[PDB]
Amino acid sequence: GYFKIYSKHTPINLVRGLPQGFSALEPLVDLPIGINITRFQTLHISYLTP
Amino acid sequence: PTYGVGYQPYRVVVLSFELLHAPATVCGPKKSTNLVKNKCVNFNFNGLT
């Protein structure tokens, strides 16, 4: 019943592909939402241009 | 305002404590004692005794 989010931010100079290396992920936040999750989806930002 | 004592409005609030088979979300106030140092003491830190 706990949703746990771990996060990490790194400055990467690679142009394409998942970089090879090790970096531990510090916990970001735990929430007692207590729901059932089976699917998910990502949302992106859009830049409106003339 | 001139009605009888038993005919006056009472503001009734019923608190219903629901306890399911799920992790709890409401708890009573947690207490704290002054921190003592350099002395064998019985310590409790967030349930770690």
From Swiss-Prot, chain A:
Changing N36Q: Increased resistance to neutralizing antibodies. Binds to host ACE2. RBD also interacts with the N-linked glycan on 'Asn-90' of ACE2. Cleavage of S generates a polybasic C-terminal sequence on S1 that binds to host Neuropilin-1 (NRP1) and Neuropilin-2 (NRP2) receptors. Interacts with host integrin alpha-5/beta-1 (ITGA5:ITGB1) and with ACE2 in complex with integrin alpha-5/beta-1 (ITGA5:ITGB1). May interact via cytoplasmic c-terminus with M protein. May interact (via N-terminus) with host bilirubin and biliverdin, thereby preventing antibody binding to the SARS-CoV-2 spike NTD via an allosteric mechanism. This is Spike protein S1. Attaches the virion to the cell membrane by interacting with host receptor, initiating the infection. The major receptor is host ACE2. When S2/S2' has been cleaved, binding to the receptor triggers direct fusion at the cell membrane. When S2/S2' has not been cleaved, binding to the receptor results in internalization of the virus by endocytosis using host TFRC and GRM2 and leading to fusion of the virion membrane with the host endosomal membrane. Alternatively, may use NRP1/NRP2 and integrin as entry receptors. The chain holds residues 199 to 251 of 1273 of the full protein. Glycans are attached at N36.
From Swiss-Prot, chain B:
Residues 21-43 are annotated as: Disordered. Attaches the virion to the cell membrane by interacting with host receptor, initiating the infection. The major receptor is host ACE2. When S2/S2' has been cleaved, binding to the receptor triggers direct fusion at the cell membrane. When S2/S2' has not been cleaved, binding to the receptor results in internalization of the virus by endocytosis using host TFRC and GRM2 and leading to fusion of the virion membrane with the host endosomal membrane. Alternatively, may use NRP1/NRP2 and integrin as entry receptors. Binds to host ACE2. RBD also interacts with the N-linked glycan on 'Asn-90' of ACE2. Cleavage of S generates a polybasic C-terminal sequence on S1 that binds to host Neuropilin-1 (NRP1) and Neuropilin-2 (NRP2) receptors. Interacts with host integrin alpha-5/beta-1 (ITGA5:ITGB1) and with ACE2 in complex with integrin alpha-5/beta-1 (ITGA5:ITGB1). May interact via cytoplasmic c-terminus with M protein. May interact (via N-terminus) with host bilirubin and biliverdin, thereby preventing antibody binding to the SARS-CoV-2 spike NTD via an allosteric mechanism. This is Spike protein S1.
